[PDB]
Enzyme design. Structure first.
Site, mmCIF file in Angstrom:
data_model
loop_
_atom_site.group_PDB
_atom_site.id
_atom_site.type_symbol
_atom_site.label_atom_id
_atom_site.label_comp_id
_atom_site.label_asym_id
_atom_site.label_seq_id
_atom_site.Cartn_x
_atom_site.Cartn_y
_atom_site.Cartn_z
ATOM 1 N N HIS A 198 0.819 -1.220 0.000
ATOM 2 C CA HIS A 198 0.000 0.000 0.000
ATOM 3 C C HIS A 198 0.852 1.270 0.000
ATOM 4 C CE1 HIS A 198 0.451 0.307 4.445
ATOM 5 N NE2 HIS A 198 0.315 1.595 4.177
ATOM 6 N N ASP A 221 -0.339 -7.496 2.080
ATOM 7 C CA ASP A 221 0.188 -6.127 1.940
ATOM 8 C C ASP A 221 1.726 -6.161 1.957
ATOM 9 O OD1 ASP A 221 0.418 -3.399 1.761
ATOM 10 O OD2 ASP A 221 -0.249 -3.006 3.842
ATOM 11 N N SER A 256 4.092 3.035 7.909
ATOM 12 C CA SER A 256 3.723 1.992 6.969
ATOM 13 C C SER A 256 4.918 1.476 6.224
ATOM 14 C CB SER A 256 2.771 2.555 5.895
ATOM 15 O OG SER A 256 1.482 2.801 6.401
#
Ligand SMILES: *[C@@H]1O[C@H](CO)[C@@H](O)[C@H](O)[C@H]1NC(C)=O
Ligand code: NA
Ligand code: NA
EC number: 3.4.21.5
Lengths: 251, 28, 10
Positions: A43, A99, A198
């Site tokens: 992502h 992910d 992230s």
């Protein structure tokens, strides 16, 4: 990272910053897994709901960093991307299942006191360490609070949470390719990843062999450090056959 | 072969300030 | 963010 602390020098020598060229800004964390390969969250690179679809030339990798914003002359190394590989079954439509993404660097990075790869887990190390209550460590340069930004890399240690508790904390469908970590409200202590973290690593130090293993990738969360919410992490071991396939095929 | 061993910590037998918290949680 | 050397942006 919310409710963490400044990293020690050389504490996380596998930490990587993904850096947008223009405008110059932090995109995500990442990790060094060999002299030519960097691991991150899919992502960070591809997220159509936010019109995010980065190509190789959009980004740089900055390795060996400590300061967030400084150019760390004679310490950090900056690498260009040869190729991005996103998991073919990454589910950006629904819940960020799978992910995970790899980036191959154009040239090998030289290891140093500040730059060194993390291990990826074997089945046995994963079985041994991925247990509720066992703590891992998350690092990054992301936000210090949900709603500012750190001078240097932040670190927090957080316990893995039982799967039913993870599931009962959210309306999102949780899969076997995710795990969650964080303290419960009744546990007093706090901490979480946040925006900008992230793609960075959740690591554990094996008590069997003294080595650090990357068990997770910072994937998603509902806010940051909210009571009764947990951070969710990509389960690296569960996706390791894909990792190996990519590295075997592409070098 | 050398993955996961930090030059400024494991390679010189120095511990960081909070790795013991991780070890204490590994109760098997 | 501090400017990085131009060599990395070419
Ligand atoms: C992302 O960008 C590439 C082109 O560089 C394109 O071919 C691809 O279809 C895009 N993927 C999505 C989901 O938009
Ligand atoms: Na639920
Ligand atoms: Na929480």
């Amino acid at each position: 990272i919310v409710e963490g602390s400044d990293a020690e020098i050389g504490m996380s020598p596998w930490q990587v910053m993904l850096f947008r060229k223009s405008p110059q800004e932090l995109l995500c964390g990442a990790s060094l897994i060999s002299d030519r390969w960097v691991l991150t969250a899919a992502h960070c690179l591809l997220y159509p709901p936010w019109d995010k679809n980065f190509t190789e030339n959009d980004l740089l990798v900055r390795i060996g960093k400590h300061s967030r914003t400084r150019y760390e002359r004679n310490i950090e190394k900056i690498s260009m991307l040869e190729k991005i590989y996103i998991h073919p079954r990454y589910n950006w439509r629904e819940n960020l299942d799978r992910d995970i993404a790899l980036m191959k660097l154009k040239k090998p990075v030289a290891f140093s006191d500040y730059i060194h790869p993390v291990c990826l887990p074997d089945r046995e190390t994963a079985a041994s360490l991925l247990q509720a209550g066992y703590k891992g460590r998350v690092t990054g340069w992301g936000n210090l609070k949900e709603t500012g930004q750190p001078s240097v890399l932040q670190v927090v240690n957080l316990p893995i949470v039982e799967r039913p508790v993870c599931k009962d904390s959210t309306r999102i469908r949780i899969t076997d390719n995710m795990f969650c970590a964080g303290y419960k409200p009744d546990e007093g202590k706090r901490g979480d990843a946040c925006e900008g973290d992230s793609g960075g690593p959740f690591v554990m130090k094996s008590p069997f062999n003294n080595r650090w293993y990357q068990m997770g990738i910072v994937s998603w969360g509902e806010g940051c450090d909210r009571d009764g919410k947990y951070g969710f992490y990509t389960h690296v071991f569960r996706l390791k056959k894909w990792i190996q396939k990519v590295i075997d095929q592409f070098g | 072969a050398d993955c996961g061993l930090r030059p400024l910590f494991e390679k010189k037998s120095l511990e960081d300030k909070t790795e013991r918290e991780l070890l204490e949680s590994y109760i098997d | 963010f501090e400017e990085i050397p131009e060599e990395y942006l070419q």
